[PDB]
């Protein structure tokens, strides 16, 4: 089953981007739908063999084959439909691998799209959109960098010494100066998840324009 | 009683500013305390006769008289204390008028200090800090301006026609095109007060760095 290998992608609140690759284009549209165009070259020009349109929740997949014959020319935007409609769990295996391409893209975009920026007395924290276990960067004013992933934890020092850690396994053992930074960065993390939760809940009820991205505080 | 004429001022979250006037300096410090320096000129130079330091909540007033004799020279910052301490309700009448000077300043600063900026599909709304009945500007993307005070309501049109209204007394009667804008601006207002309320409540519990100013959304 497809659900056993990935979760449906979520493109809500992500800025539009049309990213070209050698055999394909993957796109986050204005509608927040995620589009993947399959691209083949013939006669020294590039065409579009099939299109996978995914809804903003990755539940609905629309698929069409534009026809020349046999295809449509590459453009600044995706071809108009002229069609098969699936739900995530009824998507046939031949398309899974492609969906994972779009899925894997969104996931990466999400991990770089700030969701909550928060300014403390010592640092500008940034909770990213790749929930759950979203990336979390703490850019201290004094120059120190910290970055948290679901797995590992990278630290940089003013000096620029760059290094990384496992799941807090190595946590206790560190320069207690560093102990000071990580505590404060974890304080920020608790704060940001709380803010995420309440704002999310109010957004759930409100139903109009998004409450993220969000910058909070100053200095 | 002083409380019968004004409320204690609140300087929380307001950016520092040292504003000179002809007979005085009024200042919002880094500590968020609000300082008023009384200034007199002698011998072609300016001095400082007395200083009124007010806590960030306007409850505590510290008052001193720096001595030359008879005074201290004007500076880039307020004179250091060398003193009388009052609480708002025990402040003697001779100082009320001065406190109202600082009070009236803060109030004006508050009315221009954004608290929540919120981006909709049609406009960037801005709830200001002068609570309650805080000023509320709606800057539509298409050019239209709207501004709400506790009393009156100013509208500008793309054309730049500038005009104002009483307490919605005149509300119903307007170009229904204008009816469209005001409804959406009032939608934003409901949203911003709700966000203010929940974020405020979480801030009340959290107790660390401020949750305002705050920018919310995009486009």
């Amino acid at each position: 089953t497809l659900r056993s290998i990935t979760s449906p992608l979520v493109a809500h609140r992500l800025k539009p981007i049309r990213q070209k690759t050698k055999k394909a284009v993957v796109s986050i549209l204005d509608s927040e739908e995620v589009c993947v165009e399959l691209v083949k070259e013939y006669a020294s020009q590039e065409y579009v063999k099939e299109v996978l349109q995914i809804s903003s929740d990755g539940n609905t997949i629309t698929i069409y084959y534009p026809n020349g014959g046999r295809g449509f020319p590459l453009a600044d935007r995706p071809p108009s439909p002229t069609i098969s409609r699936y739900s995530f769990d009824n998507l046939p295996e031949k398309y899974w691998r492609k969906y994972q391409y779009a899925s894997r893209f969104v996931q990466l975009v999400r991990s770089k799209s700030p969701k909550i920026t928060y300014f403390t007395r010592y640092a500008k924290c940034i909770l990213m959109e790749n929930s759950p276990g979203a990336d979390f960067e703490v850019w201290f004013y004094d120059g120190v960098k910290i970055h948290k992933t679901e797995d590992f934890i990278q630290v940089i020092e003013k000096t620029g010494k760059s290094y990384t850690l496992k799941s807090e396994s190595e946590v206790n053992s560190l320069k207690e100066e560093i102990k000071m930074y990580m505590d404060h960065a974890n304080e920020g993390h608790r704060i940001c998840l709380a803010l995420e939760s309440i704002i999310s809940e109010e957004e759930r009820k409100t139903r109009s324009a998004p409450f993220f991205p969000i910058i909070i505080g100053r200095k | 009683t002083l409380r019968s004429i004004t409320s204690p001022l609140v300087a929380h979250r307001l950016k520092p500013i040292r504003q000179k006037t002809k007979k005085a300096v009024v200042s919002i410090l880094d500590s968020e305390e609000v300082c008023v320096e009384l200034v007199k000129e002698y011998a072609s130079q300016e001095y400082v006769k007395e200083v009124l330091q007010i806590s960030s909540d306007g409850n505590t007033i510290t008052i001193y008289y720096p001595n030359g004799g008879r005074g201290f020279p004007l500076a880039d910052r307020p004179p250091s204390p060398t003193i009388s301490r009052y609480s708002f309700d025990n402040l003697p009448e001779k100082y009320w008028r001065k406190y109202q000077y600082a009070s009236r300043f803060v109030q004006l600063v508050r009315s221009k200090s954004p608290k929540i900026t919120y981006f909709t599909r049609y406009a960037k709304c801005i709830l200001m800090e002068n609570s309650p009945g805080a000023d509320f500007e709606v800057w539509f993307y298409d050019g239209v301006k709207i501004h709400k005070t506790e009393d009156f309501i100013q509208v500008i049109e793309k054309t730049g026609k500038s005009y104002t209204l009483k307490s919605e007394s005149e509300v119903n009667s307007l170009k229904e095109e204008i009816k469209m804008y005001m409804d959406h601006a009032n939608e934003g207002h409901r949203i911003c007060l709700a966000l203010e309320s929940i974020i405020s409540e979480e801030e009340r519990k959290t107790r660390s760095a401020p949750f305002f100013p705050i920018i919310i959304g995009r486009k």
Partner: peptide, 29 residues
């Protein structure tokens, strides 16, 4: 239809986009 699972997408076109997203918090700087 040779497969796309290969495709590498994170290029400098993207880095810029990523740049853009962080630009907004770049306000007190």
């Amino acid at each position: 239809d040779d497969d796309i699972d290969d495709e590498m997408f994170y290029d400098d076109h993207l880095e810029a986009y990523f740049e853009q997203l962080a630009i907004p918090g770049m306000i007190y700087e």
